[model samples]
Target: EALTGDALILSDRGWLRIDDPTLQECRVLSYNESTQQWEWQQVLRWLDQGVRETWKIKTFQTEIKCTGNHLIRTDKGWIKAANITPKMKILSPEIDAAVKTALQDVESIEKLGVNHVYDIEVEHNHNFVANGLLVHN
Candidate 1:
């Protein structure tokens, strides 16, 4: 799903909006599926996916606003925002480890009407962490 422009992105300096200008100078957390590890990768650019209906996905510890078509990491691999169910688990980076990702249960998923959505062009991995959740670029 497309993310709202204000969505927070985990960056080297700290959490920053996807559309923040300073984000261009920062690196973001990305998952390396092959290595089974997490790494900081460069932010190539930001993109405007246009205004669209977005969904607010709430987890036990965090939440994100994104387009229904956005992909989120799950135990069964990536799943679209609209298809996520409360019983499904979403992947979150372990606070103290770089190689492990924790599973967070979905608490709720709600429609948030129309909003401007944005995305980032990430380096190598092609995906980055947002609002504490691993998401596709």
Candidate 2:
């Protein structure tokens, strides 16, 4: 599962693109599956996955573009981007209050053409917040 180069990642320096020059080694927001809490985790590396087919997932508050296999945090658990339906709700960090997470309903999911995709390897959780939503590395 890979995201687009422009995907925003929440970091100590604020939101930064996955492809940003300063991304590597940065401390970014990550969800600890064991602790069930959010934490700032170090980024091990940034990757360029090359051009690939992608999908645009739109929720009431925000949207994200990534490969069909990208794992998104749904109410029930993580699910592939292609498998998400309008009835499912995704966990998104509240924009106004960064400390809180909200479940937003999916409005649409559309297939996108081939485009450069990127990803980041997080230290502990192996997942990070992308475009305000929790997504797998």
Candidate 3:
């Protein structure tokens, strides 16, 4: 939150955070020691495995596109995703389905406002992670 400014510019990466490096990499750009807030950036951790995202928060009429963790098309140009621990993981129904559907599912999981981000505190039948597994001896 900006202390001087009343409005908080929201974005796509705000919700779904994946600690997985393949999703993105984060760094501090500019820091305001007084307020303890810093300008940050997210570089593609691995370009080939990363994702660029677009989203709209209907309540705020806000639209955000996140390419390599930089959210373009906002007053706050290229803002970084949350940096605190307990990162997020986008989820969907096809997590164990056909490859095409699974990709679509993970993408859709990215769309949720983050009822899905990982938090050990939030426990339930669904409070966990699941992905395709290939065990090799």
- lDDT tens digits, residue span 1-137, model 2: 57787676677676778777546767877668888877788888877889798888888877888887767888899898889998999776554545676788889988776888888788888888777777887
RMSD of 3: 18.6
Runs off by more than 4 Å, candidate 1: 97-100
| Best by the lDDT measure | 1
lDDT of 1 by residue, 14-88 (tens): 678877755567788888876777888898877788878888888996888987677788878888878999898
lDDT of each: 0.80, 0.78, 0.21
**Tens-digit lDDT track for model 3 on 43-64?**
3232122222322221122222
Among all windows of 10 consecutive residues in model 2, the one with the lowest summed lDDT is 92-101
Error in Å for residue 90 of model 2? 1.2
Candidate with better lDDT, 2 vs 3 = 2
* Model 3: ten consecutive residues of lowest lDDT: 128-137
